[PDB]
Amino acid sequence: AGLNTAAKAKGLKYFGSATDNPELTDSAYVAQLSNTDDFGQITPGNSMKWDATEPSQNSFSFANGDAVVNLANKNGQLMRCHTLVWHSQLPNWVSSGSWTNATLLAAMKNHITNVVTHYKGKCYAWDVVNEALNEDGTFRNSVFYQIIGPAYIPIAFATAAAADPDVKLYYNDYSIEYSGAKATAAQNIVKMIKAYGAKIDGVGLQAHFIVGSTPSQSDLTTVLKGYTALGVEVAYTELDIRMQLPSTAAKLAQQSTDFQGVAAACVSTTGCVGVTIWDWTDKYSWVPSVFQGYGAPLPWDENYVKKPAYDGLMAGLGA
Numbered sequence: 001a002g003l004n005t006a007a008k009a010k011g012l013k014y015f016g017s018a019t020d021n022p023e024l025t026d027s028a029y030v031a032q033l034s035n036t037d038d039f040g041q042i043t044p045g046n047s048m049k050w051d052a053t054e055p056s057q058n059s060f061s062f063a064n065g066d067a068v069v070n071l072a073n074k075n076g077q078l079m080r081c082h083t084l085v086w087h088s089q090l091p092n093w094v095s096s097g098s099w100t101n102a103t104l105l106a107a108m109k110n111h112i113t114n115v116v117t118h119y120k121g122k123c124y125a126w127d128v129v130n131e132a133l134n135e136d137g138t139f140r141n142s143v144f145y146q147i148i149g150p151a152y153i154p155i156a157f158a159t160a161a162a163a164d165p166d167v168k169l170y171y172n173d174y175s176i177e178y179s180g181a182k183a184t185a186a187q188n189i190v191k192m193i194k195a196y197g198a199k200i201d202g203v204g205l206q207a208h209f210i211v212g213s214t215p216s217q218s219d220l221t222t223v224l225k226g227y228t229a230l231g232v233e234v235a236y237t238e239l240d241i242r243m244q245l246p247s248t249a250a251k252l253a254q255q256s257t258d259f260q261g262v263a264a265a266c267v268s269t270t271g272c273v274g275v276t277i278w279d280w281t282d283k284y285s286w287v288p289s290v291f292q293g294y295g296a297p298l299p300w301d302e303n304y305v306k307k308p309a310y311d312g313l314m315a316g317l318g319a
């Protein structure tokens with residue numbers, strides 16, 4: 001019994017967790033990350049991003065990404081590979097370049113081909129393009145969008161497909177999990193990629209939610225079905241539910257209800273293949289350093305002890 005065994009019993013492919021290389025030297029941490037009752041899938045939190053894999057142009061660095069793949073491979077866990085094209089965690093040579101459409105397109109395609117070719121056969125899915133939308137659903141004015149225009153999105157997908165025809169190609173974003181301008185625009189990215197004749201298999205819903213402000217199970221399910229109706233699969237890719245500190249029994253209970261609704265929405269949607277939490281212990285959560293006054297976002301606490309959210313997840317997975 002555990003999150004992943006429970007998820008597979010309801011026809012999900014996995015329940016999984018992100019991690020990061022610095023944490024792999026923590027033996028108690030790695031023992032629980034390697035617990036396949038709870039985790040059947042791993043995402044590298046940083047070591048397959050552009051700054052990590054191509055720190056100088058045409059100079060590729062795969063050791064840290066390969067370390068996470070090797071752990072998943074030893075444990076029998078699926079990989080989600082993350083992420084090819086993103087405005088954040090670009091190396092200096094991308095962000096500082098004097099580019100034409102032609103020279104940035106060649107550099108983007110070369111990044112994708114090299115990284116996807118290296119990981120061919122290793123990934124369940126790639127987050128091909130990450131966070132291409134503004135909160136109003138217009139295109140984020142990244143260097144890719146400014147220099148190439150909207151075509152950079154389907155071109156990224158087509159370039160990934162050519163290098164690895166089998167991996168599921170996902171568009172990944174946050175604040176697309178509930179009805180609004182951004183979710184509508186994420187549907188429209190699915191439609192645009194297919195209009196270009198390029199392949200998109202999945203929508204990745206980050207699910208960085210807030211305790212007591214989490215969308216209802218019903219609102220989440222409506223949005224999941226809105227994507228699956230377009231002939232793609234879906235997954236919750238980076239689930240965490242950040243609480244206004246300090247922690248209280250009431251906030252931990254609300255967090256449990258919030259997590260339970262996310263898992264239950266996925267279980268209720270044919271085509272929702274799985275849930276990945278953005279790491280699993282509060283000790284290593286990205287949240288407190290980014291969201292002032294927020295924290296304690298995960299189903300285990302900073303001592304690797306289960307919080308009520310672990311039970312809420314198990315209930316939402318119908319265990």
Ligand SMILES: *[C@@H]1O[C@H](CO)[C@@H](O[C@@H]2O[C@H](CO)[C@@H](O[C@@H]3O[C@H](CO[C@H]4O[C@H](CO)[C@@H](O)[C@H](O)[C@@H]4O)[C@@H](O)[C@H](O[C@H]4O[C@H](CO[C@H]5O[C@H](CO)[C@@H](O)[C@H](O)[C@@H]5O)[C@@H](O)[C@H](O)[C@@H]4O[C@H]4O[C@H](CO)[C@@H](O)[C@H](O)[C@@H]4O)[C@@H]3O)[C@H](O)[C@H]2NC(C)=O)[C@H](O)[C@H]1NC(C)=O
Nearest residue numbers: 101102105146147148149150151152155192193195196197
């Ligand atoms: C850098 O270099 C690259 C590589 O050379 C350049 O790539 C080109 O980029 C073009 C877009 O900038 C892209 O055009 C698109 O092609 C796809 C696929 O079209 C083919 O297949 C379809 C379907 O079978 C067929 O109908 C076509 O005839 C083609 O055979 C189209 O889906 C796209 O269509 C959308 O956009 C056009 C153009 O929209 C702009 O201009 C209009 C009118 O002036 C304006 O109203 C609009 O707001 C835009 O400013 C529309 O006319 C279409 O109706 C489509 O619009 C829908 O979809 C958009 C999203 O894609 C929505 O934003 C829009 O509201 C609406 O819902 C489009 O024609 C080329 O395929 C691509 N070429 C290659 C070789 O990859 C790149 O431009 C260049 N960048 C720069 C900055 O120079």
